[PDB]
Paper text:
[name] (also known as FabI) is an essential component of the type II fatty acid synthase system (FasII) involved in fatty acid elongation and is required for mycolate production in [name]. The FasII system is highly conserved in bacteria but absent from humans making it an attractive drug target. The combined results unambiguously indicate that pyridomycin is a competitive inhibitor of the NADH-binding site of [name], NADH-dependent enoyl-[Acyl-Carrier-Protein] reductase, the target of the two anti-tuberculosis pro-drugs isoniazid and ethionamide.
To further investigate the mode of binding of pyridomycin to [name] at the atomic level, we crystallized and solved the structures of wild-type [name] and [name] (S94A) mutant in complex with NADH as previously published. In an attempt to obtain crystal structures of [name] in complex with pyridomycin, pre-crystallized [name]:NADH or [name] (S94A):NADH crystals were soaked in a pyridomycin solution. This suggests that pyridomycin may induce major conformational changes upon binding to the NADH co-factor pocket of [name]. As an alternative strategy to define the pyridomycin binding site in [name] attempts were made to co-crystallize [name] or [name] (S94A) in the presence of pyridomycin alone or with the octenoyl CoA substrate; however, despite testing over 1000 conditions, no diffracting crystals have been obtained to date. Data were indexed, integrated and scaled with XDS. Both wild-type [name] and its mutants crystallized in the P6222 space group with unit cell dimensions of approximately a = b = 98 Å, c = 139 Å, α = β = 90° and γ = 120°, with one molecule per asymmetric unit.
Residue numbers in the entry:
A (entry chain A), B (entry chain A), C (entry chain A), D (entry chain A): 3 to 269
The structure:
């Protein structure tokens, strides 16, 4: 097992097609003992996570709640047992109000909406790291989920801005995490058909947005020298596991592209 | 005159060592007619700008004020005369509460403070562009001021995060600005001794921050193959002018490094 | 005149649709006095350059010839007059044998052919700089022509490899050029319909290569927020002039994208 | 075993402090069956490789020899047995004549010397891939060794140019390798004290070169948020193994930084 005996917190499970669902699944298949956090529908998350190959305690964490964050390390050492520490943290959390993404014009997202999106999608990566670094082992590993924001793209709008901020946060958390013997890195995934992503191709955020996102995915798979299957999250899940393992021991403040090699190719 | 007959709005003058002061000065030396915006001490800004080689109307603009932004294009066409449009916009605005920069630990900046900094330093670049694109000529040019955030650095902390968000905003404003025949670009400047920067090397934000910033500047000048003079803002001012001119007509969504070539060199 | 009184060597004119032809034209329109170099058909180059707005001495330079390079600065100070120096050098030279570009498979280009291409397209940028730096003024400027090699693309093959090597050479020539007070930079141009580029879209190097190159150009213009006109080299010519001028005084070891902003956009 | 049952060719062992030595060692500790190639002193390489935890056939390969390359896949299937294929190729080969690296001035390396260096250090990555792709399994993995050439640095000179060319080659080999179901990637290592690197810090290539290289290493370890130990190649070896495994299944045409996170930090 790649992850044998490691104890690892995985956030971000909301449905069984959440990228964090598959990260959890692969991590357990690989020997890891998990603690899970979930945001707002804990009954639902409890029922989805019943499906994982092994039981895992589930704690509530709303990344905008000072109090949840303040108590987090206590609730975790409670769940894993006093004198035990975390080897791994997975941040797989993201959100942008719909005004920052539609065919809703880029200049019309108001700042309260984008600030909410950056709070949850970028800043929260530092918050998690602050709450959890005190309970991590030397040799530990924090991983977040990224979508390559280095060129602008249609429809993603402020969510791309949010990702740009995240990558920058990640280089700072790596500075802090290093004092603990801990790595911090991002996985830049190719587009994956979550519920939300399907809703958007189906037009939930405007028809032209849906059309641009559909073209985005097809181009991705054409460029990728090994192809990209948007319906299969397990290559991303394996990549997060690769970072949680002892096999990337000199990589930090960094970004690993789990995207079919698409970003390396112009067409 | 590089900028002959162009009409250009320059924001961000607060003292005579503001990078926007010198941008204004060089632009006027080069034939430009200016409109100036200023934030909170308009009496002071009025008195500093008296020093520019030519008179220029001064309008108040607090980039966090919906109302100032809503009225901005009216106040400007008023100042430049109905049926006249802007050829140029300079965004030279930046701020981060001191909790997001000290030896104040990176994980301790609260989100309200960083959100304030991102509002003013990143989001405001889109706001300015939204208010002003309706009154710009085809062939126009929007320029903002950047500090290369692509690697983390000591002390700059959340301000670097704010710059990462800005560069991403800039690639989106370029999408919008293109519909108007307008370029949008950033100038990534080397460190320049503003009042604030001096205050920090003098220790205003903690002694170790001051020491890291001093080391930052010295390394910069050593790497720069043509050297870097932190006391001279005029090479940056000329670069902003180069972008405001007709001489970079195919560059947009882009970043021009006015930094002595330092970012191209490891040591 | 942007370039008034500057003396500037422009290499690379072969026909009237050479990017160096237009660089020469715009530079002369802008006040520059030129010296021209040309490679193998000097009678032809003489006749094409008769068309420039002003006369210019023409010297022969085969960048693979040790002797031409050894004598170059002598022939130039002869043409510009003893005690006069160059303010500007334009390198607009490139070549790759057809085995390194066809539908000719990437793995089949033999090393002698690629070495020839790298010699002329990458190494020669250092050679020119070595021959000419002794006769350049402080404040001078060397500019080469680049095609963004940072992602692989169909058909360009080893020429992209050659461009990657060039950009790296450029960061080193900037180290040397700095000792003389001289900037060194690259202009990354969008695709431009030279004779050769037309020959390729017409299928000179295989039908699928021609088809991939045609798709390359169309994507370019779609992404570019201000569009890209492959038939108009004058926006690139103006950009080279912007670098030859005093208006980018703190940029070196660098790359300026004259590409419609296409590289900043994913789609 | 991370690499259980995989068959893997590792080139580049010359002494027991070769990065390929440790790659071989870790790969064998991890279940891999190896075939080894070696360049010019095969008796010596035979004796060094006796030290590996398991026996491995050793074949001669001079990457500049057309004939060695032409016969390579035959000699390998001979060594691994007909109907068996390679899962892994490690390219850990590099060389630049000393004229392209000293305090020997950058402009004085003659083209024959740099062409030799690029042949062996960059082009040879495509040659290996051409010889070996016919004998690789779907799901296979080719890995080369890189030193981040994205900024110029003292003393490395033309070897940095050679690395820039390599990274570009790698993005093309990924295009070819994809048709076979095969990944191609580079590991960008921090500086490691091979014999050669020690010789250089000891001044073999000039005193100021030695001094710049010493400063290079110290800066590296200061920037690296998790530090860098130049005497320990095993974190790099583990990284190459991470790429040879099934745990990075969606990464190709890419670069993984095994460098302590140093490239993500300015100071
Ligand atoms: N789906 C795609 O094509 C790609 C997604 N990503 C990133 O993957 C990560 C996971 O998203 P997906 O699995 O795709 O969608 P998802 O919707 O399954 O996951 C998003 C998670 O964020 C959690 N969340 C939202 N607000 C929260 C808050 N205040 N506190 C705590 N948690 C909160 C949600 O409960 C949900 O579990 C996100 O960062 C996303 O940006 C990266 C690349 C591609
Ligand atoms: N000084 C340095 O070493 C470098 C500075 N920069 C950037 O240059 C730009 C200008 O800053 P400097 O001239 O260095 O300092 P400065 O303090 O002279 O300029 C900052 C300007 O931001 C304006 N501002 C702050 N909040 C505002 C608000 N709510 N509305 C409108 N304006 C507001 C201030 O009034 C001031 O005029 C900033 O974006 C800065 O980040 C970029 C590279 C280097
Ligand atoms: N055409 C395009 O779409 C783009 C071209 N570029 C670059 O622009 C530069 C100029 O090429 P173009 O004007 O497009 O084509 P061109 O064919 O007009 O110019 C190429 C020049 O290289 C010169 N040359 C070849 N071998 C030489 C040698 N041994 N010594 C001296 N000169 C030699 C040729 O005589 C010719 O004048 C090249 O570096 C090219 O790679 C950059 C971006 C786009
Ligand atoms: N040592 C360092 O600080 C770093 C080295 N690298 C790269 O690691 C790779 C391995 O080099 P090291 O282990 O450091 O040194 P090394 O000297 O142990 O390995 C170099 C290998 O290249 C082989 N070689 C040279 N010419 C050859 C030819 N014609 N045919 C076949 N093989 C040939 C040599 O026999 C030797 O085994 C090289 O690509 C190097 O550039 C990357 C980052 C850092």
């Amino acid at each position: 097992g790649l992850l044998d005996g490691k104890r690892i917190l995985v956030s971000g499970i909301i449905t069984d097609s959440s990228i964090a669902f598959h990260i959890a699944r692969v991590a357990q298949e690989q020997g890891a003992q998990l603690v899970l956090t979930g945001f707002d529908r804990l009954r639902l998350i409890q029922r989805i996570t019943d499906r994982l190959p092994a039981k895992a305690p589930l704690l509530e964490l709303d990344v905008q709640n000072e109090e949840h964050l303040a108590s987090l390390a206590g609730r975790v050492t409670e769940a894993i047992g006093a004198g035990n520490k975390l080897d791994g943290v997975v941040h797989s959390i993201g959100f942008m109000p719909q005004t920052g993404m539609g065919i809703n014009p880029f200049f019309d997202a108001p700042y309260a909406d984008v600030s909410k999106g950056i709070h949850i999608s970028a800043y929260s990566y530092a918050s998690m790291a602050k709450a959890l670094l005190p309970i991590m082992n030397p040799g530990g590993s924090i991983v977040g989920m990224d979508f390559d924001p280095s060129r602008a793209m249609p429809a993603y709008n402020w969510m791309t801005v949010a990702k740009s901020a995240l990558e920058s946060v990640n280089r700072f958390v790596a500075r802090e995490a290093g004092k603990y013997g801990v790595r911090s890195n991002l996985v830049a995934a190719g587009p994956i058909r979550t519920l939300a992503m399907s809703a958007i191709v189906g037009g939930a955020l405007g028809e032209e947005a849906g059309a641009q996102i559909q073209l985005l995915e097809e181009g991705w798979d054409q460029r990728a020298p090994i192809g990209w299957n948007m319906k299969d999250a397990t290559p991303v899940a394996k990549t997060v596991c690769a970072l949680l393992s002892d096999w990337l021991p000199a990589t930090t403040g960094d970004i690993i592209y789990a995207d079919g090699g698409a970003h390396t190719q112009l067409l």
